[PDB]
Protein backbone atom coordinates (compact mmCIF):
# COMPACT_ATOMS: atom_id res chain seq x y z
CA UNK A 1 0.00 0.00 0.00
CA UNK A 2 3.13 2.14 0.17
CA UNK A 3 3.58 0.85 -3.37
CA UNK A 4 0.57 2.97 -4.34
CA UNK A 5 2.76 6.04 -3.85
CA UNK A 6 5.11 4.88 -6.61
CA UNK A 7 3.59 5.97 -9.93
CA UNK A 8 4.65 6.26 -13.60
CA UNK A 9 6.00 9.74 -14.32
CA UNK A 10 7.66 11.06 -17.48
CA UNK A 11 10.26 8.57 -18.68
CA UNK A 12 10.66 7.12 -15.20
CA UNK A 13 8.72 7.05 -11.93
CA UNK A 14 7.88 9.18 -8.91
CA UNK A 15 6.91 8.87 -5.26
CA UNK A 16 4.25 10.53 -3.12
CA UNK A 17 5.98 11.51 0.12
CA UNK A 18 2.65 12.95 1.23
CA UNK A 19 -0.65 14.16 -0.20
CA UNK A 20 1.05 17.36 -1.30
CA UNK A 21 4.65 16.29 -1.94
CA UNK A 22 5.73 14.30 -5.00
CA UNK A 23 9.38 13.49 -5.68
CA UNK A 24 11.11 12.09 -8.76
CA UNK A 25 14.36 11.97 -10.70
CA UNK A 26 14.93 15.28 -12.48
CA UNK A 27 16.24 13.56 -15.61
CA UNK A 28 13.00 11.63 -16.18
CA UNK A 29 10.46 14.35 -15.40
CA UNK A 30 8.29 16.06 -18.05
CA UNK A 31 9.61 19.43 -19.35
CA UNK A 32 9.56 22.41 -16.97
CA UNK A 33 6.06 23.88 -17.14
CA UNK A 34 4.13 20.74 -18.08
CA UNK A 35 0.64 20.10 -16.71
CA UNK A 36 0.78 17.06 -14.41
CA UNK A 37 -1.94 15.14 -12.53
CA UNK A 38 -4.48 17.58 -13.98
CA UNK A 39 -2.60 20.42 -12.32
CA UNK A 40 -0.84 23.32 -14.03
CA UNK A 41 2.10 25.42 -12.77
CA UNK A 42 0.85 27.82 -10.12
CA UNK A 43 -1.09 25.00 -8.51
CA UNK A 44 2.31 23.55 -7.63
CA UNK A 45 5.82 24.83 -6.91
CA UNK A 46 9.08 23.23 -8.03
CA UNK A 47 12.38 22.78 -6.20
CA UNK A 48 15.43 20.73 -7.18
CA UNK A 49 18.96 19.68 -6.26
CA UNK A 50 21.05 17.67 -8.69
CA UNK A 51 18.79 14.94 -10.05
CA UNK A 52 16.27 15.25 -7.22
CA UNK A 53 13.06 16.99 -8.27
CA UNK A 54 10.37 17.96 -5.78
CA UNK A 55 6.76 19.00 -6.43
CA UNK A 56 4.65 20.72 -3.78
CA UNK A 57 0.95 21.09 -4.55
CA UNK A 58 -1.01 23.68 -2.56
CA UNK A 59 -4.03 21.39 -2.80
CA UNK A 60 -3.82 17.67 -2.00
CA UNK A 61 -3.66 15.34 -5.00
CA UNK A 62 -3.59 12.17 -2.92
CA UNK A 63 -6.03 12.46 0.03
CA UNK A 64 -5.72 8.82 1.07
CA UNK A 65 -2.12 8.97 2.31
CA UNK A 66 -0.39 10.48 5.39
CA UNK A 67 2.97 12.25 5.40
CA UNK A 68 6.07 10.06 5.29
CA UNK A 69 9.30 11.43 6.73
CA UNK A 70 11.80 12.48 4.06
CA UNK A 71 15.48 12.52 4.99
CA UNK A 72 18.68 13.49 3.18
CA UNK A 73 20.13 10.02 2.64
CA UNK A 74 20.94 7.68 5.53
CA UNK A 75 23.74 6.16 7.61
CA UNK A 76 26.23 3.97 5.73
CA UNK A 77 25.59 0.26 6.18
CA UNK A 78 21.84 0.69 6.51
CA UNK A 79 20.01 -1.77 4.26
CA UNK A 80 17.34 0.16 2.37
CA UNK A 81 14.70 -0.90 -0.15
CA UNK A 82 14.36 0.49 -3.66
CA UNK A 83 10.67 0.25 -4.52
CA UNK A 84 10.96 -0.64 -8.21
CA UNK A 85 7.90 -0.79 -10.46
CA UNK A 86 7.69 -1.91 -14.09
CA UNK A 87 5.27 -1.01 -16.88
CA UNK A 88 3.62 -4.42 -16.50
CA UNK A 89 2.75 -3.47 -12.93
CA UNK A 90 5.36 -5.80 -11.45
CA UNK A 91 6.81 -4.74 -8.10
CA UNK A 92 10.41 -5.45 -7.10
CA UNK A 93 11.58 -4.54 -3.60
CA UNK A 94 15.36 -4.52 -4.03
CA UNK A 95 17.47 -4.59 -0.87
CA UNK A 96 20.31 -2.07 -1.14
CA UNK A 97 23.13 -1.53 1.34
CA UNK A 98 23.64 2.24 1.31
CA UNK A 99 27.22 3.48 1.40
CA UNK A 100 29.37 6.46 0.47
CA UNK A 101 28.52 9.53 -1.61
CA UNK A 102 29.74 9.76 -5.21
CA UNK A 103 29.33 11.64 -8.48
CA UNK A 104 28.09 10.39 -11.85
CA UNK A 105 27.19 11.69 -15.31
CA UNK A 106 23.60 11.08 -16.37
CA UNK A 107 22.90 13.36 -19.32
CA UNK A 108 24.62 16.69 -19.83
CA UNK A 109 25.21 16.99 -16.09
CA UNK A 110 27.47 15.58 -13.39
CA UNK A 111 25.14 14.73 -10.51
CA UNK A 112 25.82 13.59 -6.94
CA UNK A 113 24.09 11.11 -4.64
CA UNK A 114 24.52 8.33 -2.08
CA UNK A 115 25.72 5.08 -3.63
CA UNK A 116 24.38 1.67 -2.67
CA UNK A 117 25.28 -1.98 -3.15
CA UNK A 118 22.51 -4.22 -4.47
CA UNK A 119 22.11 -7.19 -2.14
CA UNK A 120 21.79 -10.60 -3.77
CA UNK A 121 20.06 -13.15 -1.56
CA UNK A 122 19.79 -16.84 -2.38
CA UNK A 123 17.06 -17.10 -5.02
CA UNK A 124 18.90 -9.01 -11.84
CA UNK A 125 18.90 -5.45 -10.54
CA UNK A 126 17.58 -2.24 -12.07
CA UNK A 127 16.95 -0.96 -15.59
CA UNK A 128 17.01 2.62 -16.88
CA UNK A 129 13.45 3.81 -16.41
CA UNK A 130 13.43 2.50 -12.87
CA UNK A 131 14.76 6.00 -12.27
CA UNK A 132 12.60 8.04 -9.93
CA UNK A 133 11.76 5.06 -7.74
CA UNK A 134 12.15 5.74 -3.99
CA UNK A 135 14.72 4.39 -1.55
CA UNK A 136 12.88 3.52 1.66
CA UNK A 137 13.70 1.84 4.98
CA UNK A 138 12.11 1.35 8.39
CA UNK A 139 13.28 3.62 11.19
CA UNK A 140 12.18 1.41 14.07
CA UNK A 141 8.42 1.80 13.73
CA UNK A 142 8.37 4.49 11.03
CA UNK A 143 8.94 4.36 7.26
CA UNK A 144 11.39 6.89 5.82
CA UNK A 145 12.16 7.74 2.20
CA UNK A 146 15.78 8.79 1.68
CA UNK A 147 15.93 9.50 -2.05
CA UNK A 148 15.00 8.67 -5.63
CA UNK A 149 16.70 6.20 -7.97
CA UNK A 150 19.08 7.86 -10.41
CA UNK A 151 20.86 5.01 -12.19
CA UNK A 152 22.77 1.75 -11.94
CA UNK A 153 26.47 1.60 -12.74
CA UNK A 154 28.06 -0.49 -15.51
CA UNK A 155 25.81 -4.11 -8.52
CA UNK A 156 26.20 -0.46 -7.52
CA UNK A 157 23.31 2.01 -7.67
CA UNK A 158 23.11 5.68 -6.70
CA UNK A 159 20.21 7.69 -5.28
CA UNK A 160 19.66 11.44 -5.45
CA UNK A 161 19.02 12.87 -1.99
CA UNK A 162 17.50 16.14 -0.81
CA UNK A 163 16.51 18.10 2.28
CA UNK A 164 17.96 20.36 4.95
CA UNK A 165 18.13 18.50 8.30
CA UNK A 166 15.95 19.93 11.08
CA UNK A 167 18.99 20.27 13.33
CA UNK A 168 21.69 22.84 12.56
CA UNK A 169 25.09 23.10 14.24
CA UNK A 170 28.33 24.98 14.74
CA UNK A 171 30.91 27.13 12.99
CA UNK A 172 34.44 25.71 13.07
Residue numbers in the entry: 4 to 126, 132 to 162, 165 to 182
Paper quotes:
Whereas ORF2, ORF3 and ORF4 each encode single proteins, ORF1 codes for a large polyprotein (∼190 kDa) that is processed by the virally-encoded protease at five specific sites to release the six ‘mature’ non-structural proteins (NS1/2–NS7)—and an array of functional precursors—that are required for virus replication. The viral NS6 protease present within the C-terminal half of the polyprotein performs all the processing, including its own autocatalytic release from the precursor. Norovirus NS6 is a cysteine protease with a chymotrypsin-like fold: two β-barrel domains separated by a cleft that contains a Cys-His-Asp/Glu catalytic triad similar in arrangement to the Ser-His-Asp triad characteristic of serine proteases. To this end we extended an inactive MNV NS6 construct (which incorporates a C139A mutation to knock out the active site nucleophile) by adding residues from NS7, which is immediately downstream in the polyprotein.
To investigate the structural variation in substrate recognition we also made an NS6 chimera which interchanged the residues P4-P4′ of the NS6-7 cleavage junction with the sequence of the NS2-3 junction from MNV (NS6 4′ 2|3). NS6 4′ 2|3 crystallised with two molecules in a P1 unit cell. The modelled monomers start at residue 4 and end at residue 182; in contrast to the other structures reported here, the A chain lack density for the tip of the eII-fII loop so residues 162–163 were omitted. The A and B chains each extend their C-termini into the cleft formed between the bII-cII and eII-fII loops of a neighbouring molecule. The packing arrangements are distinct but rather similar and, once again, lack specific contacts that are consistent with productive substrate binding.
